[PDB]
Design a protein around this ligand. Sequence first.
Ligand code: ATP
Ligand code: MG
Length: 272
Amino acid sequence: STMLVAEDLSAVGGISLSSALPVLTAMQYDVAALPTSLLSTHTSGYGTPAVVDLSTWLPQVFAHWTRAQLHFDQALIGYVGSVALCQQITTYLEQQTLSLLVVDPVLGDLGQLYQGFDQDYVAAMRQLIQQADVILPNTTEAALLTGAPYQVTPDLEVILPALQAQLKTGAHAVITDVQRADQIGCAWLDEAGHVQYCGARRLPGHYNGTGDTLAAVIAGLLGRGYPLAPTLARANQWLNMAVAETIAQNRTDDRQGVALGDLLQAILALNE
Ligand SMILES: Nc1ncnc2c1ncn2[C@@H]1O[C@H](COP(=O)(O)OP(=O)(O)OP(=O)(O)O)[C@@H](O)[C@H]1O
Ligand SMILES: [Mg+2]
């Protein structure tokens, strides 16, 4: 099958689209790799990157694909970056008949919207997520989506249903960076409306591209028919492993995204 992946491409950095590609390809997908933005390097640690504004390009891309009669099976949407691009993506996706749409609602972290994002971006995001089968906000994002003031540990019994209220029936809101004791992981509502959690032991440090890889792995697994719970279980273990690998490399450069070798190996093994 074919998966559309629409997110930022940084030439240097090993995150987002650059990490999605190997991952998804190895997971047996033909990837339609669509940059929403093109950068010299990611935005953390290399100084101001050189960036291409793709706002006038994506409409052309979509128009083209349309006339060419291309149809996508699955879609993963990551970092978009502008109100207009979200709008464009939203309508394009509406035209497709997707069996799977996963949207990582990139908006912020540590209680605040990322620089450049305002409440207009937030509203644009709320529109984009309306058809999503799964959304993967972090704790800050969840709050922003619902309009609840940020809480470091929000009440999952409250925020989860609130989020679900914005999604279609049967879709799922999964909060991704939930910390419980020495664990870090994902929380969501099961079919009976009960809060579930699946985590792995938190490792020291902070890494780039973790969210990106998590999203790719989740899309990929779901795309292949794995129920949500087992998907989340595996994704978390896989990320844990990737971060472990990363530490193991004893890197001198803390900017490069999470290592993928072990992850690719795991994917190949699952494949048989
Ligand atoms: N230090 C860590 N140790 C273990 N696992 C981690 C760690 N950091 C992240 N993870 C894993 O990766 C997932 C990604 O969560 P995270 O909160 O980092 O995504 P994110 O908000 O996009 O972060 P990033 O900002 O780097 O994308 C977590 O669910 C967990 O599975
Ligand atoms: Mg994230």
